[PDB]
Amino acid sequence: SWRDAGISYLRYLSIVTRCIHEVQKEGPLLTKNVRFSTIGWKSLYLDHGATKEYTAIPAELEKIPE
Amino acid sequence: WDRAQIVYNRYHGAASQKLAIFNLPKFEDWKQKLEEDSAGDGKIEEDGLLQSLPMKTALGELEETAVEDFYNFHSCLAVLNAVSENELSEYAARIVAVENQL
Amino acid sequence: VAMCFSSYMLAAARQPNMSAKLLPYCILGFALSEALALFTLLIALLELFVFS
Amino acid sequence: VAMCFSSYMLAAARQPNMSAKLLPYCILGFALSEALALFTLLIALLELFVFS
Amino acid sequence: VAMCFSSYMLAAARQPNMSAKLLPYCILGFALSEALALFTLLIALLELFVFS
Amino acid sequence: QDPRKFFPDNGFRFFDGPEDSFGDGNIPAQIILTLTRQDEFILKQEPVAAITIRTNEGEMGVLAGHEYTVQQLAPGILEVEYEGGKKDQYVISGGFAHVNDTGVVDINTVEAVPLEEIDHEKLAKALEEARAKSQSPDEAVRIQGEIALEIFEPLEAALH
Structure with a gap:
């Protein structure tokens, strides 16, 4: 199953939440809940002077951290 | 890590945005504290604290993977509350620190 | 007989603070579970040293 | 016999407050199981001290 | 007999630090459960080397 | 140097959780049900007659003075029955449900939406x-x- 695949229980709940937000009806509630599933954030770490993306843990849920 | 001190801003009101922290123990440390406190009699060791002996028994009944998820889940909610309180405090302190600029 | 102490162990693990309240209902269930064996044993010991 | 107490322990663990209200049921079940045992024992004692 | 140690195992695996306070109620069920065996074993050995 | 100008509060304190008493009296007639999604609640300590939950082990029922128990919620639906005989059903995404011996059920989930909105x-x-x-x-x-x-x-x- 998905357990030994390497993903966390929390990514699992978020996948379920994404699906629920899909199937539900169009309205103000959906307008609220699509926000609670959309991915827009990032991560950054500071080089000697510059910014660089810490891409060791992705935001998308299908992938696996390594 | 052994202890994670989350730090954030607490929106007490539109005019007061103080600090607030969550002192999270480690899972391998928290499970041992769970068993140690679940054995002895349940006496609150600090004023304003809630007794939790029945919980640390019942969690002992719960399986291994599920208690791992218990810790990770409740810690996730702690994190999320910190982020939410700081968003409201950001937008509550900006109006103050902007009207003074005006 | 050992079922009683077995239950006491699992119950004490469930709630050690209750461990004191349970042992009266353990020893009671213990001896009077042992007692029948005595009532069963006594017969075979009463069966021989008096009967011809 | 112990199967009665073995429940009352676990029950008393899972809810200490109801330990007093499940007590009569436990006593009753123990007594009735013991009554069956007693009738068998009565046959054993009655089989000898009256019969030739 | 093995029921008692099985209870001790699952009780300690339920509560490790309780493992010390459960062992006193583990040996008591061990001997007295074994004790009946002795008496049950006694008769058969007492049945032969003394009776003709 | 100033000795520790700051003294941040413990954010857990602002909440008012239950005080689990082992019980020296009788049980209430209705469970105080609180259900929460991500951060905002949908129900804050509302009187409820009974509630039925879905789990990995299976489906369970909860009444007043139910045994103190905690376990995973499996991703599915939930049924709530108020004292007036009515019912209200909520789709969920996992979570943990805690039932107090006093009759106070705290449910924490990642999402909660009625069936009507699907x-x-x-x-x-x-x-x-x-x-x-x-x-x-x-x-x-x-x-x-x-x-x-x-x-x-x-x-x-x-x-x-």
Whole structure:
């Protein structure tokens, strides 16, 4: 199953939440809940002077951290 | 890590945005504290604290993977509350620190 | 007989603070579970040293 | 016999407050199981001290 | 007999630090459960080397 | 140097959790049910007669003075019955449910939406999408099909 695949229980709940937000009806509630599933954030770490993306843990849920 | 001190801003009101922290123990440390406190009699060791002996028994009944998820889940909610309180405090302190600029 | 102490162990693990309240209902269930064996044993010991 | 107490322990663990209200049921079940045992024992004692 | 140690195992695996306070109620069920065996074993050995 | 100008509060304190008493009296007649999604609640300590939950072990029922127990919620639906004989059903995404011996049920979930806000029409299309993902041999997509099916199958069976 998905357990030994390497993903966390929390990514699992978020996948379920994404699906629920899909199937539900169009309205103000959906307008609220699509926000609670959309991915827009990032991560950054500071080089000697510059910014660089810490891409060791992705935001998308299908992938696996390594 | 052994202890994670989350730090954030607490929106007490539109005019007061103080600090607030969550002192999270480690899972391998928290499970041992769970068993140690679940054995002895349940006496609150600090004023304003809630007794939790029945919980640390019942969690002992719960399986291994599920208690791992218990810790990770409740810690996730702690994190999320910190982020939410700081968003409201950001937008509550900006109006103050902007009207003074005006 | 050992079922009683077995239950006491699992119950004490469930709630050690209750461990004191349970042992009266353990020893009671213990001896009077042992007692029948005595009532069963006594017969075979009463069966021989008096009967011809 | 112990199967009665073995429940009352676990029950008393899972809810200490109801330990007093499940007590009569436990006593009753123990007594009735013991009554069956007693009738068998009565046959054993009655089989000898009256019969030739 | 093995029921008692099985209870001790699952009780300690339920509560490790309780493992010390459960062992006193583990040996008591061990001997007295074994004790009946002795008496049950006694008769058969007492049945032969003394009776003709 | 100033000795520790700051003294931040422990943010846990602002909450008012239960005081689990072992009970020296009788049980209430109705459970005080509190249900929470991500941060905002939907129900704050409302009187409720009974509640039925879905779990990995299976489906459970909760009444006043139910035994103190905690376990995972499996992603599905939830049924709540108020004292007036009415009912209210909520789709969830996992979580943990804590039932106090005093009769105070605290439920924490990642999502909570009634059944009324879902249509079988839009649900139907996602099913074969999840099935195609499940049948498509790939560890990254197979699990997604399986999981979306896990939440859709109780909905497909509950609407019907």
